[PDB]
Amino acid sequence: NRLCTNCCAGRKGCNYYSADGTFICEGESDPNNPKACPRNCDPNIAYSLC
């Protein structure tokens, strides 16, 4: 069950970790108007944990 999403451009109130098991970050900007963040897909993140 692969997942395509980045912590930066994720959803406020969630968490995203890498594939190897290295947590990226949590509690990021909201989807409505997120701060300076990338647009491409982040395959590094296995899945989100909300």
Side-chain angles (χ1 to χ4, degrees):
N1 295 317
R2 285 279 202 175
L3 216 176
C4 173
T5 189
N6 199 359
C7 172
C8 201
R11 304 260 266 286
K12 186 272 245 216
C14 283
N15 170 233
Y16 303 83
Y17 90 121
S18 193
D20 273 11
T22 299
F23 62 96
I24 314 298
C25 44
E26 45 66 75
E28 260 56 41
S29 213
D30 262 81
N32 300 352
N33 204 314
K35 298 210 282 285
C37 281
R39 283 298 313 166
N40 263 314
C41 184
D42 202 306
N44 219 239
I45 293 109
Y47 52 69
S48 89
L49 299 315
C50 313

